[model samples]
Target: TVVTTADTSQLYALAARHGLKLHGPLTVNELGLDYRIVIATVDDGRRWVLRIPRRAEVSAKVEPEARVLAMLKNRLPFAVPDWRVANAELVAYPMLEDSTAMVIQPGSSTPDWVVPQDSEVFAESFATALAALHAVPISAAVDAGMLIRTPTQARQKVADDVDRVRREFVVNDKRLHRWQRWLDDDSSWPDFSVVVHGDLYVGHVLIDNTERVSGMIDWSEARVDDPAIDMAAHLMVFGEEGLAKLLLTYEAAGGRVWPRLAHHIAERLAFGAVTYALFALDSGNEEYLAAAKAQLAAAE
Candidate 1:
């Protein structure tokens, strides 16, 4: 049941049955395997986001997300999806599969809010929020059934990724060499682990008009892994200046800055940009190609 106009109609019917009194539905341009997102306006002049699973296997992804949210409730300073509004339960049609619908209040800011001028302020809040996330005891996440990777396993995984990207993508020798050097230099690897928002990036972070980090969404990729992955993601999107501020504030917020922080940032810059370039080439998407090329240039 690929989501279509028919599914949209069914979603409206579901909203009606729940007494939501929604007007029309508006689609959100978010692409992911787990969920189809939309915005529907209530007759009372409120907006809520409706997320339905994109596939049957999305149930496996949804359950863990709910658990992570429940575990982190009131633990972080910013807003996360409030499951109380739409608890994890299977819903009827419009939902493509036997899946749950999680309704979250929309974030207060638009994606374009992260401008350079006030980035410092947002960086402070971002660091604080991220620190709170990483500070969650790994045992708590593991007990909740999140994947745990040993330091050795994590290193090997990254190495394998570099190898795959080199084989499949048009990676510059200098960037690839830098990545290899970092991978070979085992001294920088941290022994400790934290609960990483495995897919943390600009898209997942929401900043309000006041230039403060307001909310974060998409927790399905959360795991107990190297904290630097999240750090690298921040650097990849916001560049060095924003990351420098984040590091200073991260330490102030009680998060330990690891030795390999810069190394990880370089690793992501090389790997992520190249991967996206390959994706753009295969998809014949010129915009993505241009963006990927721009990222590569910036990293260099």
Candidate 2:
């Protein structure tokens, strides 16, 4: 399914089903693969986001994500999606006031603006904010019924991912050897797992007028997993200098850090090729399949 719709009338009807009356313009965003996203304005001029799932499997994840939002409501200093109306058919929330770190135009896949890595306010604040998010106690996740994985289990999951990819596709020998070496690296693995965003990146983060990270959206992947799952993307987005600033503030904020934390994060990033390949494979899109195959055959 393409999961795209430009029909404003259809969106208006969906909003009405949830008791929301829209009187203004409706804008559609097709960035999500599982849902058709729309920004609708109500009679009172408040903006709301409506996510219409394209598949039943996508709808089934809605309830768990709602639980995640409810769990984090009072825990983090920043804002998260508050789904006032969430159902199998529609997930709606008042749009957050802050702007996302990156802005992808309606018809364009590439974002026009990604918050520059030089913004200390953004980088430092994001690191501390991440520390705060990761600081949430395991008890909280357990109480929220979030997925919990031990370090060993986390490692096993990555191994399984690699094995699945290997079985499904013919990857570059160098890439295969790289993953094999990464899996056998004992010192690169974390000893403990922490609550993680599971898909943290600049695109998912929102920044205020001062360039400070004010909110994080998308909790469908929230769970207890490897702590580095959150940091690996920071290294990619922010680069070494940016990641250094992040790691410094992160450690200073009392978030746990190991001696090989940076190196481990580097390794985790290398495995993104596998993860993305798997995601693309599942999408059943020829374009994504071609891209994933290219990525699989490429060197790090």
Candidate 3:
């Protein structure tokens, strides 16, 4: 049962049969890792994103993501994707009503609507959001009993976690080896020991046409670790100014800027640059791969 355009129509019919009101023009929408058939009608509109994991052992990834979204829901000034469904069978996030077209940068072209508006405001808001997630009193979320994975654990399982890239995608391992050494040295590691969105990147933050950050997305790689883990992500995408703004925003939000965490920034640069480069390659994206390679000299 390969799903196709006609298959979606039957699914929509089934939804209607179940008394689940549906909208119209069920056009196909593809974003990063999901394929969504967007159906919009007069009153209610729904987006059905089909996600079938490429592997069977990758179950834990999605659950942590749900927890991360739930954790960040309230504090963020903007909307987070509302979970419509999740289980062994399916996972879906409904498109909210206010979710408008995303904004674009001046030079960015075609499907580049994912760009941020006033990148500064976005940095501040996201910095505070990251700090807030870390500020989750560590014990609260742990007490709330959300399942968490450590950065080290996740990294060790990199072979399994990123199997697609490990087995067939990435070509450069020297850079990856450099990162492994940095992580292994253990001397430059950050030590705050809180939670972080381990895979935070420019694309994960969603923006609207009005130049405002409408929301944040993609928590599939969230982890409970040093705040610097997330901080380094901002630094990577936003650079020195954005990084400084992130730290200042975090501090303003009462996030304790730990010296140990500062140590991890370079290490994160070393490791993250490599990992993201591999990811870019796995994704068949030259832009991200190139951006990552450009950081190789900087990280070294």
Candidate 4:
């Protein structure tokens, strides 16, 4: 049923039929981009997440995310969101019902599930995860003809992607303007790119009631890129501290630190903040707009 409204009786009926209860609609407003609802379903008297989509644009993210999550699941030390069911639009996951959630979202200081919380404790874990991911190398996502050579190249590719989005929006975006000021400097990196969770973050990670990590969610942006590209999420989520911990852990885990990894991280952060901030504004997400401003200001 291609229902548009969130407060529909059909929604509740669907939940009842499936033995699930829909929580408050996390999808705010009818601006068309917010989530439809954050439903918590009770199955056999147990709860699960019954998330449904509200817009058609994000539809493309569904299948690829499911594919990426499946591949990265057991390989990760943390708990990831389990994909239970999917059709053309909706994806259902086993409700990570009882859990000690992490502070997720852009421009915050939460290390992603992939990155260890403690620098000293998980340095090896961080490095080994990168090495293993690099070890399990795959072909390029778009146009398999070219191999993603180095972290710098991957970062540049993302920058180039930013250009594409700018062209598509048909407007001069201030967010992009803010980012350009920060990244228009000399940036360099060492060769060695790997497939990474393109949009990795703490919100993507799930922690159980005992505070143990269960898994990650949202792999739509997974791609072949520089390891530091994933590392930038640390900077965005945890600011400077998260950035330092990421490098410390990665280096401790047998991952070689590049001469200009910091520069690459800055570049990724600048562009990432602008790109997402512009997205939030376009979608009328005031909360995200403020977040974008904070990140852009930090990079500045």
Candidate 5:
């Protein structure tokens, strides 16, 4: 059943069905497009996450994410969601206590707080965790049945997205030209690929009280593909000096760094516009469509 609203008592009943007894103070997070996320407190002083899918297609992706988490837990030093309850109706896990570095509240576009960019502790910890995450062997990801894309395929995918955007939306000429130039430039692209947390960003990164990265959540986009897929978000959040430190720290921790890795990251960052526009178009939400169209036509 599609769960559009997940109330406290409704959650209590759902938890009971899963053999979990709930108490009070359940939090409903509707920021997710595919799932209604609820943080439920159990009677026994424990907390669990209930991920209720909004549609059948979203539910279909749950099992693969579970497999990815299972394969990733041992490989990386940090934590991934341990889904004790995973099915079509609900996917539940014991809540990882660590909080995300940035918190955007329900119906709010801006975050309440973002970890200070200059926090050496956070930057280093995140770089180390990201390095460890990227270092997970491709064979293991393949074994876990992750979506795999070769280097050429990754580049081709970007090209395809740009083509689709051009056809569907009236993108600014400068933005289209830049994307075309990026597609034409082969040297700016990486020759190798790796297992990537495709949508990694500070928002998905869970930091312990001590400000160290303790876990990552949202595995729906995890795949064996472009390394830059992960770095672009870092660049978006952290900016130049922070990204420079991240790349250095990542390389020191045994991550591969190409000569034009920074440049590639810049190009990938620009592509987010295309990604967002497509997402807006597909959603068919009038507000999102208007915003996306404005973004597409805005000066770069």
Candidate 6:
């Protein structure tokens, strides 16, 4: 069911049916997709996350994410949510794009906890978490419907993305020429792919008071793909120093460092900047527009 707005009353009733009593405002999570993510103090002060997807297609992410989280439970050194309660459909709210709502134990802290002074430590711990996530068996992800590709196919995917971005977003530019050459040159691409956190960014990671990685959230984009995608995103969000530290920790923690990390990072930045620029232009988001232009300029 698709809705114009999220109905919190319906959400509360649904929680009631599951033996939970919500006693707070349904806090909205504005990260990736539109969703009502409530930190409900239920049944004797216990807290749980109540998430309702506003986008219809986001419903598809729920089941897969739940499965992935289950598969990853206890496998990593840090924490990930185990859906204490997950109902893909609750009929009270038909206007909801996807009636899929889930409840999980809330994180001790969110990514907003990271400050500059502690970014280095946070980056190191974050790297360890990424290494653990990447180490998960590829077969498990394949069984879960993540697309697996050969090295050639991966390069083709990048080429296809570049072509699409150029057609839909960018005009003739010197950076496009460099990107073309990188795509054409496959000498640095990885021979094997690993399971990666497809949408890994600071917002999805959780840190504790001690600045250690306590948990990670939102697995909607987990996939078997080039590890460089995640690495590049990490670098993009944090900085060069953070990326260097992450790579060092990743290797020290028994994670294999991909040889072509720099090339792939460049590929992501260039393409991502183009895509975001187009999105900003279409949506009139001034912040994203400026960010896109700045990233595009830096990509060169």
Best by lDDT: 2
Q: Give one digit per residue, the lDDT tens place, for model 2 in 37-147.
A: 888888769999888898999999998888878899899999998899999999999999799998877668788999987788998889899999998889999888899
Q: Where does model 2 exceed 4 Å of error?
A: 1-5, 107-109
CA lDDT of each prediction against the hidden true structure: 0.66, 0.89, 0.56, 0.57, 0.88, 0.65
Model 4 residue runs over 4 Å out of place are 1-8, 12-34, 97-136, 139-156, 161-187, 208-212, 237-241, 281-299
**On residues 132-163, what C-alpha lDDT tens digit does candidate 6 reach at each position?**
88898888877666767666777777777667
In model 3, which runs have C-alpha deviations exceeding 4 angstroms? 1-6, 13-19, 30-77, 97-119, 143-177, 184-187, 208-214, 260-263, 273-300
Which scores higher on lDDT, 2 or 4? 2
> Which portions of model 1 show Cα errors greater than 4 Å?
1-7, 14-25, 30-34, 43-45, 84-113, 166-175, 274-300
Candidate 1 lDDT over 1-300, as tens digits, reads 575633556777766665566675455634533466666665766566676666566655666677787777777777777653342332211211111112233443334333453566777888898889888887788767877887877777678766765665565667778777878877667777788887787667777766677777767678787778787767766778777888888888999777767666656655665556666665556776677666645536
Query: Which candidate number maximizes TM-score?
Result: 2
For each candidate, how many residue pairs have backbone atoms clashing (under 3 Å)? Answer: 0, 0, 4, 17, 0, 2
Pairwise TM-score winner, candidates 1 and 3? 1
Clashes of 4: 17
Candidate with better TM-score, 1 vs 4: 1
**Deviation in angstroms for 231 in model 3?**
3.2
Candidate 3 residues 1-300, lDDT tens each? 775654556555545543445555554434434323343342245554433333344444556556657766775566767655554334455654433334444235544453343456566666766666677656655754555556566445543433444444443657556655655666555444676666666656665544445666656656566556666656655567666667777888988776555556756665554466577666667787677556553435
Better of 5 and 6 by TM-score: 5
Model 3: what TM-score?
A: 0.66
lDDT of 2 at 127: 89
Tens-digit per-residue lDDT, 145-219, candidate 5: 899989999998999999999999898899999999999998898988898998889989999887889999888
For candidate 3, the per-residue lDDT at 99 reads: 39
Residue 99 local lDDT, model 6? 14
Query: In model 5, which runs have C-alpha deviations exceeding 4 angstroms?
Result: 1-6
Model 6 CA deviation exceeding 4 Å by range: 1-8, 17-19, 30-33, 89-113, 117-120, 274-300
lDDT of 4 at 115: 35
What's the distance in Å from true for residue 204, model 1? 1.7
